Amino acid sequence: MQKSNKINDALNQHYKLNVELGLVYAHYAHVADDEFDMPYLGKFIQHLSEDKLGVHKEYISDYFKRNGMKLKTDVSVAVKSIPSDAKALIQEVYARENEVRDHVKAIAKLALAEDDYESFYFIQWYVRDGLKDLTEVDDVVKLFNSSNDKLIIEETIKEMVE
Amino acid sequence: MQKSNKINDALNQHYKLNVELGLVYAHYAHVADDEFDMPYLGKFIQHLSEDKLGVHKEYISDYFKRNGMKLKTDVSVAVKSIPSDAKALIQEVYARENEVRDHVKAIAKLALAEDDYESFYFIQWYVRDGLKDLTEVDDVVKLFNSSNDKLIIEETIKEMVE
Amino acid sequence: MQKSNKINDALNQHYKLNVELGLVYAHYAHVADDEFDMPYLGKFIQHLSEDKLGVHKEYISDYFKRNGMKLKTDVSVAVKSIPSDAKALIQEVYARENEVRDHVKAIAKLALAEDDYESFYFIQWYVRDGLKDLTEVDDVVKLFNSSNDKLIIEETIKEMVE
Amino acid sequence: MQKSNKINDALNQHYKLNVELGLVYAHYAHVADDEFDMPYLGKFIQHLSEDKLGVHKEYISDYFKRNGMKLKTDVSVAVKSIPSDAKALIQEVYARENEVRDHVKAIAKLALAEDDYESFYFIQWYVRDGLKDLTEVDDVVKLFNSSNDKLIIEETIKEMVE
Amino acid sequence: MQKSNKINDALNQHYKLNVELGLVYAHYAHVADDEFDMPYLGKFIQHLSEDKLGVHKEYISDYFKRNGMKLKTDVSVAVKSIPSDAKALIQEVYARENEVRDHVKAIAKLALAEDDYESFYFIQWYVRDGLKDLTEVDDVVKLFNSSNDKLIIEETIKEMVE
Amino acid sequence: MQKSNKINDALNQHYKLNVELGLVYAHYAHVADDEFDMPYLGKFIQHLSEDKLGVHKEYISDYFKRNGMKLKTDVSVAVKSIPSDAKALIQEVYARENEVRDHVKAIAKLALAEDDYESFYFIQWYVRDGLKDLTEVDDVVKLFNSSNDKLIIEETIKEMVE
Ligand SMILES: [Fe+3]
Ligand SMILES: [Fe+3]
Ligand SMILES: [Fe+3]
Ligand SMILES: [Fe+3]
Ligand SMILES: [Fe+3]
Ligand SMILES: [Fe+3]
Ligand SMILES: [Fe+3]
Ligand SMILES: [Fe+3]
Ligand SMILES: [Fe+3]
Ligand SMILES: [Fe+3]
Ligand SMILES: [Fe+3]
Ligand SMILES: [Fe+3]
Ligand SMILES: [Fe+3]
Ligand SMILES: [Fe+3]
Ligand SMILES: [Fe+3]
Ligand SMILES: [Fe+3]
Ligand SMILES: [Fe+3]
Ligand SMILES: [Fe+3]
Ligand SMILES: [Fe+3]
Ligand SMILES: [Fe+3]
Ligand SMILES: [Fe+3]
Ligand SMILES: [Fe+3]
Ligand SMILES: [Fe+3]
Ligand SMILES: [Fe+3]
Ligand SMILES: [Fe+3]
Ligand SMILES: [Fe+3]
Ligand SMILES: [Fe+3]
Ligand SMILES: [Fe+3]
Ligand SMILES: [Fe+3]
Ligand SMILES: [Fe+3]
Ligand SMILES: [Fe+3]
Ligand SMILES: [Fe+3]
Ligand SMILES: [Fe+3]
Ligand SMILES: [Fe+3]
Ligand SMILES: [Fe+3]
Ligand SMILES: [Fe+3]
Ligand SMILES: [Fe+3]
Ligand SMILES: [Fe+3]
Ligand SMILES: [Fe+3]
Ligand SMILES: [Fe+3]
Ligand SMILES: [Fe+3]
Ligand SMILES: [Fe+3]
Ligand SMILES: [Fe+3]
Ligand SMILES: [Fe+3]
Ligand SMILES: [Fe+3]
Ligand SMILES: [Fe+3]
Ligand SMILES: [Fe+3]
Ligand SMILES: [Fe+3]
Ligand SMILES: [Fe+3]
Ligand SMILES: [Fe+3]
Ligand SMILES: [Fe+3]
Numbered sequence: 015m016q017k018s019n020k021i022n023d024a025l026n027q028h029y030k031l032n033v034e035l036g037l038v039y040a041h042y043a044h045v046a047d048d049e050f051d052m053p054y055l056g057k058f059i060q061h062l063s064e065d066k067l068g069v070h071k072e073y074i075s076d077y078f079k080r081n082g083m084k085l086k087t088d089v090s091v092a093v094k095s096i097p098s099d100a101k102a103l104i105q106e107v108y109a110r111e112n113e114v115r116d117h118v119k120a121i122a123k124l125a126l127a128e129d130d131y132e133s134f135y136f137i138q139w140y141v142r143d144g145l146k147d148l149t150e151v152d153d154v155v156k157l158f159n160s161s162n163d164k165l166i167i168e169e170t171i172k173e174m175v176e
Numbered sequence: 177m178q179k180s181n182k183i184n185d186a187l188n189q190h191y192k193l194n195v196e197l198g199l200v201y202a203h204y205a206h207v208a209d210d211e212f213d214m215p216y217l218g219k220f221i222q223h224l225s226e227d228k229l230g231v232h233k234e235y236i237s238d239y240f241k242r243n244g245m246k247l248k249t250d251v252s253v254a255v256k257s258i259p260s261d262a263k264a265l266i267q268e269v270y271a272r273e274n275e276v277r278d279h280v281k282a283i284a285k286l287a288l289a290e291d292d293y294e295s296f297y298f299i300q301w302y303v304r305d306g307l308k309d310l311t312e313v314d315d316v317v318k319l320f321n322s323s324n325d326k327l328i329i330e331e332t333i334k335e336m337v338e
Numbered sequence: 339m340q341k342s343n344k345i346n347d348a349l350n351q352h353y354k355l356n357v358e359l360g361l362v363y364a365h366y367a368h369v370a371d372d373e374f375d376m377p378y379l380g381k382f383i384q385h386l387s388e389d390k391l392g393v394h395k396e397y398i399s400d401y402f403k404r405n406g407m408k409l410k411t412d413v414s415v416a417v418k419s420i421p422s423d424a425k426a427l428i429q430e431v432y433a434r435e436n437e438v439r440d441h442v443k444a445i446a447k448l449a450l451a452e453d454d455y456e457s458f459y460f461i462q463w464y465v466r467d468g469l470k471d472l473t474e475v476d477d478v479v480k481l482f483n484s485s486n487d488k489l490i491i492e493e494t495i496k497e498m499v500e
Numbered sequence: 501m502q503k504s505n506k507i508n509d510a511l512n513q514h515y516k517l518n519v520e521l522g523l524v525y526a527h528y529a530h531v532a533d534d535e536f537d538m539p540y541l542g543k544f545i546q547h548l549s550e551d552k553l554g555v556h557k558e559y560i561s562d563y564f565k566r567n568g569m570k571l572k573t574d575v576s577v578a579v580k581s582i583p584s585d586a587k588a589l590i591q592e593v594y595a596r597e598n599e600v601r602d603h604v605k606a607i608a609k610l611a612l613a614e615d616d617y618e619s620f621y622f623i624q625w626y627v628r629d630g631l632k633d634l635t636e637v638d639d640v641v642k643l644f645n646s647s648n649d650k651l652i653i654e655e656t657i658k659e660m661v662e
Numbered sequence: 663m664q665k666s667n668k669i670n671d672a673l674n675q676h677y678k679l680n681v682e683l684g685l686v687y688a689h690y691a692h693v694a695d696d697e698f699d700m701p702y703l704g705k706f707i708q709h710l711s712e713d714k715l716g717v718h719k720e721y722i723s724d725y726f727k728r729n730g731m732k733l734k735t736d737v738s739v740a741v742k743s744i745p746s747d748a749k750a751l752i753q754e755v756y757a758r759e760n761e762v763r764d765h766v767k768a769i770a771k772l773a774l775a776e777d778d779y780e781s782f783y784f785i786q787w788y789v790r791d792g793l794k795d796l797t798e799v800d801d802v803v804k805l806f807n808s809s810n811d812k813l814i815i816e817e818t819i820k821e822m823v824e
Numbered sequence: 825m826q827k828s829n830k831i832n833d834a835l836n837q838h839y840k841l842n843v844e845l846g847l848v849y850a851h852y853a854h855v856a857d858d859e860f861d862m863p864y865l866g867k868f869i870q871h872l873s874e875d876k877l878g879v880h881k882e883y884i885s886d887y888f889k890r891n892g893m894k895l896k897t898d899v900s901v902a903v904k905s906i907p908s909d910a911k912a913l914i915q916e917v918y919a920r921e922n923e924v925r926d927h928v929k930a931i932a933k934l935a936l937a938e939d940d941y942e943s944f945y946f947i948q949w950y951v952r953d954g955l956k957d958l959t960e961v962d963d964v965v966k967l968f969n970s971s972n973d974k975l976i977i978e979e980t981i982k983e984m985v986e
Contacts, residue, residue, distance in 0.1 A: 091249070285777050372571075652809075
């Protein structure tokens with residue numbers, strides 16, 4: 015029993031990702047209410063933000079405390095352009111959640127390659143939240159192709175959030 | 177009724193500060209438990225982190241949604257050195273909370289100078305949380321000069337957090 | 339301790355304003371249900387009317403009873419033209435609530451200039467209700483640009499009122 | 501089935517009256533507490549004010565919404581002289597409530613003359629509130645001829661309001 | 663962030679004032695029951711005494727603990743003459759509560775002049791208690807001009823205290 | 825049945841003492857938290873302060889109201905030096921509570937000498953509170969000789985106060 019430097023770096027990068035995405039989603043939530051007049055779209059994405067800045071980063075920090083791995087905090091993120099409309103906004107959220115699934119798959123593959131079975135298990139939670147969080151977002155992108163009425167979409171989002 | 181660009185920038189900078197401090201405190205919380213074997217010191221500072229990354233940044237974003245001001249997300253923070261022991265760790269937290277009070281005082285002074293009375297009011301919450309958050313931290317720094325026993329200090333912190 | 343005649347006049351004018359607006363909103367509420375077939379738009383604006391004719395005017399009268407200021411009742415208001423459709427109706431409500439914020443800012447500025455700190459405090463409630471009432475109205479004007487279906491808008495207004 | 505222009509005007513005038521009286525009573529309530537040191541006399545007259553500015557004007561507006569009549573809002577009222585003492589103050593309230601009964605009797609007489617039976621019924625509520633509101637006021641004017649002690653009168657008013 | 667010696671002295675003087683007034687009101691409460699046979703007048707003024715010797719002085723001491731200011735305890739007060747009757751007794755209470763409002767206004771003016779925004783906020787509580795406490799007293803002085811019967815006045819005071 | 829001037833003076837002096845001590849303890853409570861970082865020591869001494877400024881002075885004032893004795897309010901107290909550390913602080917409290925017992929014994933001795941049996945009884949409460957209050961303080965001074973750890977002492981004080 016030891017501590018894989020390779021897994022430590024991949025998990026430090028995943029920590030980095032969840033902080034930076036969460037800050038982007040926090041901004042996107044502001045825009046969804048403010049500029050696009052879709053307050054419940056904003057609540058959906060703000061909950062995504064609090065999830066990414068919350069248990070997604072805390073589980074890695076907690077995991078490090080126990081296996082002997084070192085936490086690194088290096089965060090750089092700037093929101094320099096915003097998508098043009100609400101549909102693109104949530105389409106962009108979806109693209110980044112698809113990238114999460116990819117990164118999560120790389121960590122499982124590497125944990126097995128390092129015979130780090132504690133780290134393969136730890137990541138099983140992330141293997142699923144990736145699909146769960148992606149479906150939630152997908153359920154929302156669906157709405158924008160089923161209605162042209164923002165208040166219809168908003169009402170349907172409200173019950174997803176409630 | 178309008179929108180002071182000067183106040184917008186000062187509040188965007190305060191948003192920036194509360195995100196960046198919160199990420200630093202999140203790291204400092206990890207270290208307080210992991211390296212210094214003080215789990216409740218870590219819980220105190222993690223609650224500080226969640227407060228700074230939470231209502232401190234959300235109130236500014238919510239305030240902007242109503243007065244017409246623009247949110248900017250530009251975050252750069254790297255935790256490159258850690259203090260040597262728990263006392264210095266919480267001493268460093270204190271220094272940064274003292275800097276918050278200074279920044280908050282500049283925004284009140286400027287709001288009056290701009291006759292932005294909605295913004296002077298908004299900041300009244302921050303004028304006080306600055307003193308309240310500073311006292312909480314001060315109560316903890318006190319302990320390290322009243323006992324040389326980490327488990328005594330930890331037990332006293334626990335009831336502050338409970 | 340005394341009684342600023344200047345503040346007394348500005349507060350008597352604000353009393354005047356809240357009575358006259360409330361009578362206009364009472365009419366606009368009637369029209370929103372009667373002519374535009376939007377009963378919940380009418381309930382939103384009738385609640386605005388009862389608020390302006392209620393605690394907005396009573397707090398000034400109560401404040402005068404305590405600091406020694408004289409109440410004046412001079413009310414002249416006639417609703418001679420109505421906006422063309424519901425969107426313009428609530429757009430017009432918004433314009434007048436923006437003018438409230440302006441007037442409220444003048445009273446805070448003057449209270450400080452007169453070192454009337456009891457009157458600066460009294461007005462802090464109005465500094466915020468101005469923004470709160472303006473956001474409520476803004477949330478409604480939003481709907482008319484997000485849907486072309488009056489019954490969709492009405493249903494969304496209903497839950498704001500409920 | 502139609503819409504009597506004559507009844508519409510008489511009911512628009514009654515709307516006008518109840519708004520203007522209510523604004524006068526709102527002032528008289530202020531004076532009864534402030535200048536005459538009779539806070540419960542003020543509460544009695546403030547409740548009269550809220551009643552006149554409330555269901556008295558709302559029932560006409562609601563009635564118009566259903567029979568097809570047009571609401572007019574033309575309000576002019578200025579409180580330029582105040583009675584000399586509390587007795588005269590409530591004596592003056594009484595005189596105006598006696599004038600309400602007269603106006604209400606004219607509308608019933610006219611509704612029958614126009615065979616407007618929906619409007620004769622609507623006014624039956626007002627035929628009685630006129631007598632009820634007049635008795636409440638009369639019960640108060642009674643007190644001022646039964647005691648010369650303002651605090652005795654105030655205590656008796658309090659239980660009428662409670 | 664620092665500590666204004668000028669504000670410290672003005673707040674130490676306000677501490678001094680609230681202790682000394684409270685001791686005077688404690689005596690005046692004794693006299694109101696003992697000599698003037700008005701036990702509930704005494705309870706009104708004794709509650710004023712406990713308020714001045716209580717949260718009025720404790721909030722300053724608590725405020726000092728947090729901003730770094732020094733408490734001074736220098737108290738000199740002697741009750742060498744008593745007013746002639748109950749009316750004058752409560753008239754004298756009123757005069758001193760009017761002087762509190764004046765002193766409180768000086769501290770707000772000075773806090774702004776020193777850009778001490780934490781101290782301007784702290785004093786906002788006192789800006790209002792000054793008016794609230796003055797109205798309570800004013801409500802009592804009112805009674806002595808509305809009745810010549812001490813037991814009527816006493817009964818009315820009792821429900822204010824209850 | 826009469827009124828002993830000698831007892832009146834001794835009880836007026838005891839009133840004086842309990843006011844002045846209470847103001848000193850109020851200061852000492854501030855110092856115990858602020859300078860010595862012992863918040864619960866401060867709560868112990870603040871409760872002592874509220875007791876001395878409360879029922880200790882009120883029972884004398886109430887006793888005077890019934891036997892015909894005259895209350896005098898002559899208070900002079902200045903806290904010009906503070907003890908060096910917490911141990912001395914509570915040691916000083918103890919010394920003054922020992923002086924209370926002495927003064928209380930003089931009043932009992934004098935009441936018997938004057939055959940003032942109502943006053944001998946009144947003082948029986950004080951004969952015991954003197955010993956009770958002295959033991960509470962003694963229990964605290966004990967702690968400072970049983971531990972050298974301020975946070976241990978503080979924790980033990982907390983349960984005495986709770
Ligand atoms: Fe990654
Ligand atoms: Fe979730
Ligand atoms: Fe990056
Ligand atoms: Fe293998
Ligand atoms: Fe998730
Ligand atoms: Fe629907
Ligand atoms: Fe539902
Ligand atoms: Fe539904
Ligand atoms: Fe439903
Ligand atoms: Fe800042
Ligand atoms: Fe907190
Ligand atoms: Fe930076
Ligand atoms: Fe200015
Ligand atoms: Fe905070
Ligand atoms: Fe506990
Ligand atoms: Fe414990
Ligand atoms: Fe416990
Ligand atoms: Fe105005
Ligand atoms: Fe409202
Ligand atoms: Fe006008
Ligand atoms: Fe000035
Ligand atoms: Fe409002
Ligand atoms: Fe519902
Ligand atoms: Fe619904
Ligand atoms: Fe529903
Ligand atoms: Fe009429
Ligand atoms: Fe009624
Ligand atoms: Fe008229
Ligand atoms: Fe006929
Ligand atoms: Fe009525
Ligand atoms: Fe009675
Ligand atoms: Fe009763
Ligand atoms: Fe009764
Ligand atoms: Fe009763
Ligand atoms: Fe003062
Ligand atoms: Fe009070
Ligand atoms: Fe003095
Ligand atoms: Fe300045
Ligand atoms: Fe008070
Ligand atoms: Fe009662
Ligand atoms: Fe009663
Ligand atoms: Fe009663
Ligand atoms: Fe003594
Ligand atoms: Fe006790
Ligand atoms: Fe002395
Ligand atoms: Fe003897
Ligand atoms: Fe005691
Ligand atoms: Fe312990
Ligand atoms: Fe316990
Ligand atoms: Fe315990
Ligand atoms: Fe315990």
